[PDB]
Nucleic acid binder design. Structure first.
Ligand SMILES: [Zn+2]
Lengths: 97, 49, 137, 218, 36, 64, 73, 94
RNA sequence: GAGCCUGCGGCUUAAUUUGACUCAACACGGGGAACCUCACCCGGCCCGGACACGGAAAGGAUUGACAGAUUGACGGCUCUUUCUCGAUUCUGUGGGUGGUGGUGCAUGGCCGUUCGUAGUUGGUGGAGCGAUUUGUCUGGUUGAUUCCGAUAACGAACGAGACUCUGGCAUGCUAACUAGUUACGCGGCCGUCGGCGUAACUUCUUAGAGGGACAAGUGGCGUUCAGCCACGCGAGACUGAGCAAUAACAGGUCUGUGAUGCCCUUAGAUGUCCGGGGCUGCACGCGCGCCACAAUGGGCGGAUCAACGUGUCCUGCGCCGACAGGCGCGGGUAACCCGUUGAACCCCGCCCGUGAUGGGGACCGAUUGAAACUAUUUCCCGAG
């Protein structure tokens, strides 16, 4: 009934959040669904390297990896506030529904 | 008075750092100069690969 | 319909739509070109009866198609003059009147989800025409 | 409100790229070294890392609360949306921006350029393991064309490990005769699971354990 | 353009860098800096 | 053509451990991964590749 | 996915590897190995997949290798 | 300025109650965010702090676009006898 | 070479701003400028000259004003005028501020280039009065002072390599109602069905970790080493990219910065707000590209196919319309909607038949976002 999403940029922090979320719900013996992997969205920025004009037409193409991981749970929302309160991690953002 | 309507066209958008109207990068909601976005590219999260 | 040539099917289906004169065939059928990317008028006089044959055939493959989705099918490479050519959609009116022409017959129906689909009678005549053309050779 | 995730993470980087610029001009002399933010839907906590936690504060926690009143008015935070704390780094001998900032007020106090660069070089060697490089002069010129490069101690310049093993700090010092740059490249030692250095070894290093001393043969 | 770009140029300018006191002055370094 | 980093690390393996390594690349790769902590996986296979090559020389005669 | 020619070469490889998998799971390999040698002898692309992909475009010219015309003087 | 009678007192009462002030570098903004009840432009609050800065009462830092003003122990007493308030009111610093 | 727009020179002009000039300027300063951008030009307001001292001082120092006139303007900036506002203002000498004004041959920073090649440096020791030299090499090999070896050098540090990123293939593991597949039910149709609905599953999709590839086996060549060549087996005998030293350049950038020295300007302004024009002006030169000179093409049908993308602004469906469009009804802040990205080339029929033709198109009322002047561009017809 509640769909927990995990929006993270670095995979190292993302894989650690989805790990403790499954274990954090395992102690309540809940029928949880496995973590799914949404397609990674990269942000392309092709900027000219030179600050003004003079150069050899050199472009530096930046990228920004945005990873999304979903975990579906069907359980009442009575005591899930503390389950999310022990999921503190800088760099990641949890948006429960 | 002393307020001309400028909301559509070159002159309403400017860099949020150096207040310039050239080399703007407003895709994905940045609105930065092309010579200033490179200075903060590592801070935003954009890396070269 | 898949066991036969899709070109021979639309040609045999074009005669069935012209045999029964229950279509619309508007007055401006021979003044307008079928798309802005085209330059001249079609060579065949009864292009409306052939377009309606291909229009109802696409609904059998996938339903829920409207006017904005049919003009994407009938698009081409627009010669922009000295400018490089690009893709340009067809005309919405010539596609809407075709879809409205099929509404006169009991072949298409408007689904609540959006667009137009086929009727139990539309798939009935569509398969028999595909059956009689399969027995031709 | 309800902005797409593409612009949602971009807006987070702008908030950090601009907040660092504000604390760079404000906490320059205080010894700014970095910040860490915790983007949470309840309280977005942001801490400041300075070399002197007693200078960032005021008389009795006065200046630390004054900066909180500014960040709330700029980005539109509520009265309890952000809280700035004071925390010092483990050691100052490996923070590049802390050394570049410490070298600024030295040249502003009439100190010799050569003695100041040699002072910050020995400080990195005394506090740390790997060498560094301090280049404080005019690079490209025809009259200020004095490179004055001070390089020593295992300086890496190419490859991917140049990111998490050596940090570069570029600062400016304007004087009566012009403005001078400060390029500092400090390399961190190998520290396993420690904030002193990277927890990963260099790819050009293969350590072999000693053979097992097994005298019980039969 | 020019056919011989690697040339002198102006009267008071040259292709290579030259100082007025060879480092000494109040705007450049390069003078006697041995015993410091 | 190997480089000095793999050349050096491959020789020290044989000098310290000789009663454990074999003549097969996959078996020598396992023991090299077990005792030696090599950061890269490709570099680890490069060391095991040259270690097995030295075995054909050592079994043929002494080396300098 | 792909184009017209990218699919006509895809389905011929799809049904070729289909029969060699059915004979492997329920029948003897002697029947499976017999049909593999006859297909590879004609064309190698019938069973072995081609890992070729389109290289990325590099700035300075159209495509990957080609470059814009350089103007001397 | 033009009419710095009912606006500056509204700026000083906010600057004294809260010892910080922000103003984006834009002289066309006719509505300051911290002062919305009065139709005071951004130019008035920017030029008001320019007066206090020149008097040696408040220091200013230039961000990307916004200005940050920090009051001092000598500037707070300058506003105490001007706003006619008891010395028992403390700005947002505490 | 032709046609055309974009960039450069020159000419012209009130101005037709400005940086750059072999590679290392010239579809470059994202510079695809109709106002704005704009720095240029002809002209009008504005203080946005804070703060220190005095003059002037509530028996007012002081901006605002369609009462007409004036004017480009309903700009009160000048004329004639009443006024209401009540110590912030005003005209003075100091000092501040602003500047797309000069100097990148004051500078920071950044980028380009030397220079993508395989190239640099010190410690101790040896040689020389010394600058310097050996190490850093006769030979073979390697993309690689990459290694093997030789050795007055020894032991090391940059670069290379390693590393990072990306592509590659298990009826594999871990997973899936924002991705599916195979059963089953139901409905339509004569097997078909992206028609509908719930059961299994993770091959297909997505992305987490770790397995895999080393010149490991075969053979040959090479003091036998370094390695190279050929060949079993195999998803690879691998692919592209990022990063990239030392030292140096009067290379570019004061025009990207609230980086900045000096100088200049500072109220009749080089500050900036508005109006008009220019940056697009042409006998010509150059450069980067577009589209063609069709026989392998063009013209009209129909019919199959997508990847990185993007989205508050993209679009979905009904209705109207020659079409550009317009009128209505919805979804999508996103693997959800657009969307099973129904793209062109290609494919299947027809037409045309070498003829500047149906090849090629320059130049020459109906819209749409504004201010369509200088026709922004599109749409239709004609000319071509
Ligand atoms: Zn900016």
């Amino acid at each position: 009934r509640i769909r927990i999403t995990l929006t993270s940029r670095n995979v190292k922090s993302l894989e650690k959040v989805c790990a403790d979320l499954i274990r954090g719900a395992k102690e309540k013996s809940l029928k949880v669904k496995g973590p799914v992997r949404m397609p990674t969205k990269t942000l392309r920025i092709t900027t000219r390297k030179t600050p003004c004009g003079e150069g050899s037409k050199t472009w530096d193409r930046f990228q920004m990896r945005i990873h999304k991981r979903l975990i579906d749970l069907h359980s009442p929302s009575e005591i899930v506030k503390q389950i999310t309160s022990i999921s503190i991690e800088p760099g990641v953002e949890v948006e429960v529904t | 008075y002393w307020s001309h309507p400028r909301k559509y066209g070159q002159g309403s958008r400017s860099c949020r750092v150096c207040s310039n109207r050239h080399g703007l990068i407003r895709k994905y909601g940045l609105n930065m100069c092309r010579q200033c976005f490179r200075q903060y590219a590592k801070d935003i999260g954009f890396v070269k690969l | 319909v898949k066991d036969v040539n899709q070109q021979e099917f639309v040609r045999a289906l074009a005669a069935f739509l012209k045999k029964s004169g229950k279509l619309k065939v508007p007055d401006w059928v021979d003044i307008v070109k079928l798309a802005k990317h085209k330059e001249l008028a079609p060579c065949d006089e009864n292009w409306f009866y052939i377009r309606a044959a291909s229009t109802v055939r696409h609904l059998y493959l996938r339903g829920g198609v409207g006017v904005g989705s049919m003009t994407k099918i009938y698009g081409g490479r627009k010669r922009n003059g000295v400018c490089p050519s690009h893709f340009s959609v067809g005309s919405k009116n010539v596609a809407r009147k075709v879809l409205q022409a099929l509404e006169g017959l009991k072949m298409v129906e408007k689904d609540p989800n959006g667009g137009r689909r086929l009727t139990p009678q539309g798939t009935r005549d569509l398969d028999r025409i595909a059956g009689q053309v399969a027995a031709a050779s | 409100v309800q902005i797409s995730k593409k612009r949602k993470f971009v807006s987070d980087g702008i908030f950090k790229a601009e907040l660092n610029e504000f604390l760079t001009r404000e906490l320059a002399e205080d010894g700014y070294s970095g910040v860490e933010v915790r983007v949470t839907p309840t309280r977005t906590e942001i801490i400041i890392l300075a070399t002197r936690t007693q200078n960032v504060l005021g008389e009795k926690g006065r200046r630390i609360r004054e900066l909180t009143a500014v960040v709330q008015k700029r980005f539109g935070f509520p009265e309890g949306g952000v809280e700035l704390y004071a925390e010092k780094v483990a050691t100052r001998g490996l923070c590049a921006i802390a050394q570049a900032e410490s070298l600024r007020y030295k040249l502003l106090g009439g100190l010799a350029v050569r003695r100041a660069c040699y002072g910050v070089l020995r400080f990195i060697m005394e506090s740390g393991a790997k060498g560094c490089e301090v280049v404080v002069s005019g690079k490209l010129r025809g009259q200020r064309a004095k490179s004055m490069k001070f390089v020593d101690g295992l300086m890496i310049h190419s490859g991917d490990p140049v990111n998490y093993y050596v940090d570069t700090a570029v600062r400016h010092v304007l004087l009566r005769q012009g403005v001078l740059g400060i390029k500092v490249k400090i390399m961190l030692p190998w520290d396993p699971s420690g904030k002193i250095g990277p927890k990963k070894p260099l790819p050009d290093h293969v350590s072999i354990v000693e053979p097992k001393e097994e005298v019980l043969s039969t | 353009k020019r056919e011989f770009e690697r040339h002198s140029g102006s009267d008071r300018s040259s292709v290579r860098s030259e100082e007025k006191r060879s480092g000494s002055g109040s705007r450049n370094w390069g003078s006697v800096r041995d015993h410091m | 053509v190997r480089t000095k980093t793999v050349k050096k690390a491959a020789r020290v393996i044989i000098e310290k451990y000789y009663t454990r390594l074999g003549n097969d690349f996959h078996t020598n790769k396992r023991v090299c991964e077990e005792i030696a902590i090599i950061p890269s996986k490709k570099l680890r296979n490069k060391i095991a590749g040259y270690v097995t090559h030295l075995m054909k020389r050592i079994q043929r005669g002494p080396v300098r | 996915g792909g184009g017209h020619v990218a699919q006509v070469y895809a389905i011929r490889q799809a049904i070729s590897k289909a029969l060699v998998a059915y004979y492997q799971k329920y029948v003897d390999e002697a029947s499976k190995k017999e049909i593999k040698d006859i297909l590879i002898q004609y064309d190698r692309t019938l069973l072995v997949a081609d890992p070729r992909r389109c290289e990325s475009k590099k700035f300075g010219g159209p495509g990957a290798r080609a470059r814009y015309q350089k103007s001397y003087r | 300025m033009l009419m710095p009678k009912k606006n500056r007192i509204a700026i000083y009462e906010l600057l004294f109650k809260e010892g910080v002030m922000v103003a984006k570098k834009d002289v066309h903004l006719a509505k300051h965010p911290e002062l919305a009840d009065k139709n005071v432009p951004n130019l008035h609050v920017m030029k008001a702090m320019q007066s206090l800065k020149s008097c040696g009462y408040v220091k200013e830092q230039f961000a990307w676009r916004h200005f940050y003003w920090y009051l001092t122990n000598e500037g707070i007493q300058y506003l105490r006898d001007f706003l006619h308030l008891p010395p028992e009111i403390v700005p947002a610093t505490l």
